[PDB]
Amino acid sequence: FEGDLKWHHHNITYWIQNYSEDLPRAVIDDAFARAFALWSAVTPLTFTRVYSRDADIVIQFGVAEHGDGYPFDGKDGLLAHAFPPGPGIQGDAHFDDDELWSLGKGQGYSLFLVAAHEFGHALGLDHSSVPEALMYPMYRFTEGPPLHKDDVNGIRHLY
Ligand SMILES: CNC(=O)[C@@H](NC(=O)[C@H](CC(C)C)CN(O)C=O)C(C)(C)C
Numbered sequence: 001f002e003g004d005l006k007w008h009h010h011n012i013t014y015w016i017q018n019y020s021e022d023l024p025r026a027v028i029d030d031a032f033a034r035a036f037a038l039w040s041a042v043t044p045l046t047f048t049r050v051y052s053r054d055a056d057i058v059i060q061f062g063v064a065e066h067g068d069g070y071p072f073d074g075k076d077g078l079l080a081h082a083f084p085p086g087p088g089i090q091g092d093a094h095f096d097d098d099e100l101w102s103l104g105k106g107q108g109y110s111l112f113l114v115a116a117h118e119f120g121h122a123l124g125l126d127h128s129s130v131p132e133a134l135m136y137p138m139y140r141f142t143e144g145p146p147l148h149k150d151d152v153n154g155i156r157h158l159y
């Protein structure tokens with residue numbers, strides 16, 4: 001799930017294929033939209049929601065075996081995974097629906113913060129070594145602006 005390719009276009013599209021059962025669809029749509037806004041705010045990239053398989057970034061929730069060759073591991077552990085820029089499954093983001101999805105403080109994992117991380121990968125970013133960076137390989141809930149200077153540098157270096 002590591003590559004050295006970026007998107008050659010800036011008007012990126014995404015399709016929310018299916019939903020998690022833990023949150024209302026209006027809440028999920030908004031969380032994803034706000035996750036994309038974080039990135040489009042520090043780059044010339046834009047994100048448009050479409051409803052066909054033609055989108056660049058296809059989003060889906062799955063449990064265990066779900067299509068590709070990297071099944072999820074049930075409760076906890078791996079929360080999700082995304083693929084680097086490119087055609088087909090490339091650039092897609094998958095979330096493990098065996099996890100309890102929520103938002104803000106409290107039990108469960110923030111769909112908003114995890115989405116922002118996955119979309120980072122979907123745009124070409126690799127993991128960061130800075131603990132407070134959003135791209136750090138470990139989940140950590142936080143309030144306030146999610147993107148660290150390190151995350152902003154990495155994304156602007158590509159676009
Ligand atoms: C609570 N569990 C964890 O913190 C696990 N980490 C993850 O599931 C990463 C995503 C979080 C950072 C949103 C996977 N990743 O890199 C996706 O692109 C483990 C550190 C246990 C692997």
Ligand SMILES: [Ca+2]
Nearest residue numbers: 040041042043
């Ligand atoms: Ca902008």
Ligand SMILES: [Ca+2]
Nearest residue numbers: 056088090091
């Ligand atoms: Ca794709």
Ligand SMILES: [Ca+2]
Nearest residue numbers: 074076078096
């Ligand atoms: Ca899991």
Ligand SMILES: [Ca+2]
Nearest residue numbers: 022097098099
């Ligand atoms: Ca769930």
Ligand SMILES: [Ca+2]
Nearest residue numbers: 103104105106
């Ligand atoms: Ca919560």
Ligand SMILES: [Zn+2]
Nearest residue numbers: 066068070094
């Ligand atoms: Zn997958």
Ligand SMILES: [Zn+2]
Nearest residue numbers: 117121127137
């Ligand atoms: Zn990651």
